[PDB]
Amino acid sequence: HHHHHHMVHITLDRNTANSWLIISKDRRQVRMGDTHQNVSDNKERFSNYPMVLGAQRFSSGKMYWEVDVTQKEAWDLGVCRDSVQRKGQFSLSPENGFWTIWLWQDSYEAGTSPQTTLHIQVPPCQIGIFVDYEAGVVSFYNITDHGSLIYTFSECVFAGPLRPFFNVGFNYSGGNAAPLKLCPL
Numbered sequence: 001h002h003h004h005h006h007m008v009h010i011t012l013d014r015n016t017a018n019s020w021l022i023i024s025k026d027r028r029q030v031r032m033g034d035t036h037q038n039v040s041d042n043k044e045r046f047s048n049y050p051m052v053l054g055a056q057r058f059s060s061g062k063m064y065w066e067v068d069v070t071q072k073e074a075w076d077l078g079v080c081r082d083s084v085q086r087k088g089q090f091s092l093s094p095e096n097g098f099w100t101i102w103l104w105q106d107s108y109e110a111g112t113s114p115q116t117t118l119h120i121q122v123p124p125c126q127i128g129i130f131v132d133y134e135a136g137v138v139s140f141y142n143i144t145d146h147g148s149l150i151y152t153f154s155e156c157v158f159a160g161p162l163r164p165f166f167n168v169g170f171n172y173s174g175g176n177a178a179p180l181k182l183c184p185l
């Protein structure tokens, strides 16, 4: 892929974060805390899952960013509609306004409904995410394996502004404490 030149600087929006998340001062890293992080509740916060949005909203153009997933057991990454549901239980699907992939229990899947098995020979330490708004495309790349394609959502119906989407995952196992990090351009 030659999408690197559409690189955008993503920062995390504290106001959308689950109340257990800890975002770094530079707003480029997020991890699950061991308790409530002493913030007030608001209608933006994801209540049921350790999720947060990027501050940036995209309604046109081509955008690229990279996320570090080193030593994590579980995570979700991608984009979502600005108007996705925040409270209660929901599935990650395009019908619900999400275009995502995840790791959980030693397998990688795309967030279609129902979900799709991914075929990854080299476990990624960094993921590239490419959005072509006009084309209706969201693609995921394995930076660790020379930028190899993971998955393409095509014929996407975004139906609104898009926001970068993150889930650091739970840490029931004690093996998933590591952060998600937005990698430098």
Ligand SMILES: Cc1nnc(N2CCCCC2)s1
Pocket: 041, 042, 043
């Ligand atoms: C002013 C505000 N508007 N909505 C708020 N909520 C507090 C958290 C639960 C949902 C209701 S704060």
